[PDB]
């Protein structure tokens, strides 16, 4: 026996993410206390508290997303190389150990992909399978229909629900209530696969709760940016040049990525989490939190530096400095986007940062959040770590698939670049004025 000492755990090492700053825990009054009275929109405010988290210093750039696209391209090319249809070289797909123990089939990224000049006929065909050439202009570009990322996510919060306990007796703690064997709990999950025809089949399965696999969601998402937004967002404008060169020019490498939908942003965050975990060694028992889109409460708290006296990501109430320089990239004048120097999104970090060290929280590109949009969502969310999370069913009405957008963009008026103004967009829609940055819950004491 003895006394009551502690059973301590082995200390862990926390890898600080690259390109991120630390936002401390705190409290803020979300929303605006006073209304415009000419926009006819009532003022809604709510005080909340959030915990510390890592946040990207800038919005995701074209190069950072091109890294994701290139990873998808390389993985698909390697999968095709070690395939009977295109190649057949099994060296691209490890299926055994050095000792001969059968193991999970996985790609061998150690061996380089064959060069186009140095690769054989089958290798050339496998490489070309992921490209599309315009029959008229003879331009070879990655085929968007082939750039699909597959990934799975476990619903920890849904699995922890008392109603979702895998034992019926554990679903109700009130001893006055008896457990009914005929009671079945219906659960919904997302699954996706590739049929023999090569098409992506996605569906929402609704079935009685029986196992942990009921909380696993699988997605296959085409992740190539929708560069046509420039043309579609602006009729009667000469904006096809940006549709041709924005995501494909080296000069735009450090500019924020646009044309990315909510689903594509989630896929990018999942890929980033997978990459980070693959590139680190963790002590036994270590658990890390994945990269994710910020909640709208987290975004508003970070943008205003955790101070309720700020309407913008800067202390002053004015939109310019003492010398008349604008503090962000938006539409300051009527038909005048260039009053701040930039017409379309500018290079990230072109203005001053926050007190938190964040760039372009107002203007440039509007930013996706993980929060589902509701006209009364500030009232429906919780007081601590507020979140309104909805996983829409594939056959749900389109109206239920809207997600909150924060910050305002290069084409927005000063009203919409306020840190309290909420916008929304459909989860499958990419725009030339919407980008995103990621956050990561930080284990801090």
């Amino acid at each position: 026996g003895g006394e009551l000492t502690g059973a301590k755990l082995s200390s862990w090492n926390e890898p600080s993410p690259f390109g991120m700053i630390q936002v401390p825990r705190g409290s803020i009054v979300l929303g605006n206390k006073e209304a415009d009275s000419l926009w006819g929109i009532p003022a809604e405010s709510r005080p909340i508290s959030v915990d510390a988290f890592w946040m990207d210093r800038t919005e995701i750039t074209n190069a950072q997303y091109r890294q994701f696209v290139y990873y998808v391209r390389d993985s698909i090319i390697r999968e095709r190389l070690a395939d009977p249809a295109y190649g057949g070289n099994e060296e691209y797909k490890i299926t055994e150990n050095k000792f001969g123990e059968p193991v999970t089939p996985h790609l061998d990224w150690s061996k380089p992909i064959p060069s186009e000049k140095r690769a054989t006929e089958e290798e050339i065909a496998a490489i070309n399978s992921v490209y599309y050439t315009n029959p008229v202009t003879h331009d070879r570009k990655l085929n968007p229909d082939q750039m699909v990322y597959r990934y799975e996510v476990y619903d920890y919060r849904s699995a922890a629900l008392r109603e979702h306990q895998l034992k019926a007796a554990k679903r109700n703690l009130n001893t006055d209530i008896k457990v009914d064997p005929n009671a079945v709990v219906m659960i919904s999950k997302d699954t996706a696969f590739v049929d023999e025809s090569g098409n992506i089949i996605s569906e929402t399965i609704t079935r009685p709760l029986s196992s942990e696999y009921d909380f696993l969601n699988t997605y296959i998402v085409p992740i190539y940016p929708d560069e046509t937004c420039w043309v579609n967002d602006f009729p009667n404008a000469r904006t096809e040049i940006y549709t041709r060169m924005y995501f494909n020019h080296p000069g735009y490498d450090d500019y924020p990525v646009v044309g990315i939908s909510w689903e594509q942003a989630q896929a990018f965050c999942a890929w980033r989490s997978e990459f980070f975990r693959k590139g680190i060694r963790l002590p036994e028992g270590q658990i890390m939190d994945d990269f994710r889109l910020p909640t709208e409460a987290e975004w508003e708290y970070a943008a205003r530096m955790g101070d309720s006296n700020n309407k913008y990501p800067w202390s002053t109430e004015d939109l310019r400095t003492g010398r008349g320089c604008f503090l962000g990239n938006f539409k300051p004048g009527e038909g005048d986007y260039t009053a701040d120097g930039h017409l379309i999104p500018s290079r990230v970090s072109s203005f001053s940062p926050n007190d938190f060290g964040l760039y372009d929280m107002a203007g440039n590109v509007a930013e996706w959040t993980s929060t589902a949009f509701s006209e009364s969502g500030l009232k429906q969310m919780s007081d601590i770590n507020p979140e309104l999370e909805y996983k829409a069913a594939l056959t749900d009405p389109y109206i239920l698939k809207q997600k909150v957008v924060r910050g305002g963009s290069w084409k927005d008026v000063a009203r919409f670049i306020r840190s309290a103004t909420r916008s929304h967009e459909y989860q499958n829609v990419g725009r030339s004025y919407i980008g995103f940055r990621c956050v990561r819950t930080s284990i801090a004491f």
Partner: protein
């Protein structure tokens, strides 16, 4: 019609006041002739597919999709004993009706001119302020609403008549789909009646409180000025509870 995801979300979005350590039931008269309150009034009569709150309520009652209960003075009981029979509601209030050409979704045939969509000019809102045990915050929950028809009293004078009690859970699914405009300065139909009630955008004065004597404000306030004074006093009491909950603004240290 609703998916499993939608049902789970909606069940997650409901307000539960089961273990609240503090409760207060308040009755408010919301007058539709005031700005920020006419949201439930527009349009006074149906405009194509556009109906106000009472038009929707009457249309749902003409079907069998909404159960309403008699407005009894002193108390509310939403039991089958007090469930209102639609046929014995129209002739009671002098609403001319005709036999229906379809027994499905139409118990009787009523013309829009007969329906008192524009006559109903006030509502009784039964709110419950509660203190959440787990979260330690104050919230408001709507329990029922009563439309008030304001026709012309026989022999002269005006007379306001409550019609019936509509439990909010019964009408919530139907009004969460009707998009409305919240202002005259902005005619975008971006909100719903459900958002209007949940956000507490209506402005009414208190006419009754759940007290131990079952007394209403009118029983001890003779004049309208005194009624307004008593409503202001009760509102000050509620705001005082809310303010006294917290201490961050007490700088006497």
């Amino acid at each position: 019609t609703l998916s499993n995801r939608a049902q789970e979300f909606n069940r997650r979005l409901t307000q539960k006041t089961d273990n609240a350590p503090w409760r207060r039931v308040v009755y408010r008269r919301v007058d539709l002739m005031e700005e920020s309150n006419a949201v439930l009034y527009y349009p006074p009569r149906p405009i194509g597919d556009r109906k106000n709150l009472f038009s929707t309520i009457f249309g749902l009652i003409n079907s069998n999709s909404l159960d309403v209960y008699e407005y009894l003075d002193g108390f509310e009981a939403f039991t089958d004993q007090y469930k209102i029979k639609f046929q014995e509601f129209l002739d009671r209030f002098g609403i001319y009706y005709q036999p229906s050409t379809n027994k499905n979704a139409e118990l009787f045939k009523v013309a829009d001119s007969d329906i008192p969509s524009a006559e109903v000019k006030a509502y009784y809102v039964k709110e419950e302020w509660y203190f959440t045990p787990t979260n330690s915050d104050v919230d408001i929950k709507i329990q029922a609403i009563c439309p008030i028809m304001t026709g012309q009293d026989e022999f002269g004078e005006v007379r306001n008549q409550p019609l019936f009690w509509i439990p909010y859970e019964n009408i919530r699914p139907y009004i969460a789909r009707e998009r409305v405009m919240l202002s005259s300065l902005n005619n975008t139909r971006n909100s719903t009646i459900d958002d209007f009630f949940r956000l507490n955008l209506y402005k009414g004065d208190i006419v009754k409180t759940e007290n131990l004597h079952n007394r209403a404000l009118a029983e001890y306030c003779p004049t309208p000025d005194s009624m307004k004074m008593e409503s202001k006093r009760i509102d000050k009491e509620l705001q005082g509870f809310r303010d006294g909950l917290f201490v961050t603004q007490d700088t006497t240290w």
